[PDB]
């Protein structure tokens, strides 16, 4: 029951977004598009919790509570996950230690307990094959030695493990080819149980042919100036 209303957020003292409003219910996919420099990355970042964003008015509510009053560490527990456009390299730290820690943390919050070994193991294997990751993923250091294309697919494998409620893709498709695109499509869709909702911040129209969105909005001047269904992308032409 995510509800964003008349949102104003500033970056480096400059107003970019001037009143974007959006409501997202379970099991639906929304696509945000437009030219570079219109708030897309900033919007995702604002939701994620970047420290360089002064919110100058407005509200963003999730399950009826104000999320913006909650700390960064707190938002993932609630269910927000962001696939980074530029995944960071963590030399010396294996995904296993990483994922478990990521997993326990969100498990601790929500008042639930640490998963049991064998499942975590049974789950990865099933998923590690699904996203064409190196079979020796678990032992390599997070994104070290990975190409641009390899680092991007991995955050999604992660997505399929930390069990988030709302997944946001901020141009995480950059530099990816047709081959890379289909697996990512199998990864996001496979998590669809009508449970999760998804917001796809588009880089190119690319993907909506592989991950058809239910509602489409195009952002301009930091405001939504047009909204529609999948058909909207084709119509302005």
């Amino acid at each position: 029951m995510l509800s964003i209303k008349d949102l104003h957020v500033s970056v480096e003292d400059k107003a970019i977004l001037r009143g974007l409003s959006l409501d997202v219910h379970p099991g639906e996919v929304h696509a945000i598009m437009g030219p570079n420099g219109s708030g897309k990355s900033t919007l995702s970042a604002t939701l994620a919790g970047r420290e360089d964003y002064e919110v100058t008015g407005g509200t963003v509510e999730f399950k009826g509570k104000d999320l913006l009053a909650l700390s960064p560490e707190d938002r993932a527990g609630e269910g927000i996950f962001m696939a980074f456009q530029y995944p960071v390299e963590i030399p010396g730290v294996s995904n296993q230690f990483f994922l478990q820690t990521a997993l326990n943390a969100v498990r601790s919050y929500r008042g639930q307990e640490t998963l049991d070994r064998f499942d975590f193991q049974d789950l990865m294997e099933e998923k590690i094959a699904l996203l064409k990751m190196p079979e020796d993923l678990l032992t390599r250091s997070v994104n070290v030695g990975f190409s641009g294309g390899e680092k991007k697919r991995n955050d999604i494998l992660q997505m399929a493990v930390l069990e988030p409620e709302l997944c946001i893709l901020d141009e995480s498709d950059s530099g990816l080819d047709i081959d890379a695109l289909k697996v990512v499509a199998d990864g996001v869709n496979s998590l669809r149980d009508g449970k999760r909702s998804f917001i796809i911040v588009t880089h190119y129209q690319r993907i909506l042919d592989y991950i058809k969105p239910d509602y489409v909005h195009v952002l301009y001047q930091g405001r939504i100036v047009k909204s529609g269904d999948f058909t909207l992308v084709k119509q302005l032409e």
Binding site: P87, A105, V106
Partner: protein
Amino acid sequence: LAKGINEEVVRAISAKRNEPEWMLEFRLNAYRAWLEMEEPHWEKLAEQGIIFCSFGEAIHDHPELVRKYLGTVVPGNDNFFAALNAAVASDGTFIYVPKGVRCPMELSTYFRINAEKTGQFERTILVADEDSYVSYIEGCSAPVRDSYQLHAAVVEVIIHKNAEVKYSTVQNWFPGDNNTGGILNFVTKRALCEGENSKMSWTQSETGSAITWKYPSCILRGDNSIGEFYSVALTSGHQQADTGTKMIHIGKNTKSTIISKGISAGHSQNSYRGLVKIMPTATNARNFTQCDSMLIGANCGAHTFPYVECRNNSAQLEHEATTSRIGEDQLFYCLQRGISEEDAISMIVNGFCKDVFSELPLEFAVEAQKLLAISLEHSV
């Protein structure tokens, strides 16, 4: 120990045990050496021949044993603090290891005490005669006073033909929040590979000292000697560490490895400074040193001044040093997936430090990583 130190105090700590006069005078030259010096800038099992008893008990029941090794490698007078510890020290640990014996277990005395700190000075001397394998562990983990207390230990190790010595160290102090804060760690540990095919391997994780003074050494005198050194050092608040190593290569075909990982946070300054020396007799020496540093935040300091003096035309030395960090975006990427910032900084460093903790016994490695974790959070 205080009040005071004189010649009679020395003569008083001696004679508190029926002490032979060889043990005694050793202290006196030290004391005499201390005097000429100005003060420098800020389970029950029966062996297997092995002796594992206290330092004091050793003098008393085994003097001839003690007689052959003490001061052979680190003279009383070697420097300021090593003279003062030899004199004045009652507490400590003695280990001798006999022919043909593989120590059944790894000897360790590191325990996570919560009684407050025992004693200010000590000296351990471990000697492994030929065909020996022994793992020794040293350290303590205590809460700390609101007085400056000075811990200035000295460890001497002597390793003979075909023998191996594995030396570990986990010292961890806790003075919440910022207090002194506050203990002066002025240790001089040195080991002699006498000692053809001898192998010495220093390993250490260290945390929470106010001031550190330390030069874990490997002395490769014997032919085919091998020294290795792995050191983790953390500093926080306004702590200062000054730690390193002096490597003297004399035998043929000697090889040495130095890996140091120094983490620096807040407004603290941690500096690595060590030395690789190759004598003309040290034919075909080879060293690879590595001193990586992680700095946390922008107002603290990490420094590195290695020294290499080589006097031999068969040596092959390579030395690398590299800088790494925790970035905002790196920091943010971790936090956003629900792990806290406090817990985040702890994870990355443990990953950063993985290659040193590897060389530790796995069990003390786990203990070592959880305490470094909590020493960070309190203080970062």
